[PDB]
Design an enzyme around this catalytic site. Sequence first.
Site, short mmCIF file in Angstrom:
data_model
loop_
_atom_site.label_atom_id
_atom_site.label_comp_id
_atom_site.label_asym_id
_atom_site.label_seq_id
_atom_site.Cartn_x
_atom_site.Cartn_y
_atom_site.Cartn_z
N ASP A 181 79.73 18.19 85.94
CA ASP A 181 80.95 17.87 85.19
C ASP A 181 81.97 19.01 85.26
O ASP A 181 83.18 18.76 85.31
CB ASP A 181 80.62 17.59 83.71
CG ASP A 181 80.33 16.11 83.39
OD1 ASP A 181 80.14 15.27 84.28
OD2 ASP A 181 80.29 15.78 82.18
N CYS A 215 87.35 10.46 94.81
CA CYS A 215 86.77 10.98 93.57
C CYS A 215 87.64 10.43 92.44
O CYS A 215 87.99 9.25 92.48
CB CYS A 215 86.68 12.51 93.62
SG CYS A 215 88.20 13.41 94.24
N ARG A 221 87.19 17.18 95.15
CA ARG A 221 85.92 16.90 95.84
C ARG A 221 86.16 16.18 97.16
O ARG A 221 85.49 16.47 98.16
CB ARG A 221 84.98 16.07 94.95
CG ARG A 221 84.60 16.75 93.65
CD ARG A 221 83.84 15.83 92.71
NE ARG A 221 83.88 16.35 91.35
CZ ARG A 221 83.35 15.75 90.30
NH1 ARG A 221 82.74 14.58 90.45
NH2 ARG A 221 83.45 16.29 89.09
N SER A 222 87.07 15.20 97.16
CA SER A 222 87.37 14.46 98.41
C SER A 222 87.86 15.40 99.50
O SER A 222 87.51 15.25 100.69
CB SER A 222 88.42 13.37 98.14
OG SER A 222 87.91 12.29 97.33
N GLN A 262 91.35 21.72 94.76
CA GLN A 262 92.09 21.84 93.49
C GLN A 262 91.92 23.18 92.79
O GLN A 262 92.70 23.48 91.87
CB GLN A 262 91.63 20.74 92.53
CG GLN A 262 92.19 19.37 92.80
CD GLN A 262 91.65 18.35 91.81
OE1 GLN A 262 90.46 18.01 91.81
NE2 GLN A 262 92.52 17.88 90.94
#
Length: 284
Positions: A181, A215, A221-222, A262
């Site tokens: 998370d 995502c 994440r992508s 990010q």
Amino acid sequence: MEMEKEFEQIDKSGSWAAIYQDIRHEASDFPSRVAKLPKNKNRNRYRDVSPFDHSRIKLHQEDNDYINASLIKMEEAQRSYILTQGPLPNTVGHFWEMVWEQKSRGVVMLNRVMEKGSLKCAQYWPQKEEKEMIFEDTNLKLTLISEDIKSYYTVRQLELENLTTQETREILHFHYTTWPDFGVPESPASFLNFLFKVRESGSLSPEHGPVVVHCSAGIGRSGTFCLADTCLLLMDKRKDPSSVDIKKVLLEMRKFRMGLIQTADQLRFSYLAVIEGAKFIMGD
Ligand SMILES: CS(=O)(=O)N1C[C@H](O)[C@H]2C[C@@H]1CC[C@H]2O
Ligand SMILES: CS(=O)(=O)N1C[C@H](O)[C@H]2C[C@@H]1CC[C@H]2O
């Protein structure tokens, strides 16, 4: 510089935030006028994540052709990817329309439906064989065929039917279920194992349309997934693998979608993944 020793040099000097801010400063800025039209507000999850006009995927529809999705085309590596946000309640039909129209074999999902106690994307695939889904706005039917649950990821076989023509196709759903998370994984081993499973399925190969990867926003994440895949392919293709520059590859990918990677922690994790992956491919 090479990668593994540039890596240790940034760790020892603690300058990951400065490296990452340089990338943010140098990244491309292209218009996203279609995304910002008022009629498309409920088609975007986040107001600050939009596809560029020049690389956006168009739906084959005359009313409204907009989806929050971008084509990332890597010329030297000879790979293409579609990066998209997690589907919204009012875009699940658009999502499967895109999969159909772009001739994709695989969908790569890097988030859970709920994270941090909030919804990160719609439940957009069926959970039981006998309870199929019909998307009336785009005239598609989606059926769960089989499901294989492993410790770090799940693979599903799905059947997508175009109800207008009665044509059917098999879609593979690759769901990485263990990204934490908060932060990034401590080791890249399970993420690399997952990447190799997607590769082995054919879903990234030229005999199919581009893989669809998402995502929640479709940039973090992508971005890590496609950056690691492309860097490893270039290391296999070139005479000198140490010439692959992960920062330059990332800036190339940011010509096609904003915001890929990010956080500075995601940048460090991408380096770690490529470094460890290059040893298993043969290397060391
Ligand atoms: C200190 S740093 O810039 O190099 N940096 C690395 C450190 O490990 C922590 C916090 C910070 C940014 C990412 C995170 O990894
Ligand atoms: C030079 S490289 O291997 O890091 N790399 C070549 C690759 O084809 C991509 C991305 C990057 C530079 C521009 C583009 O050609």
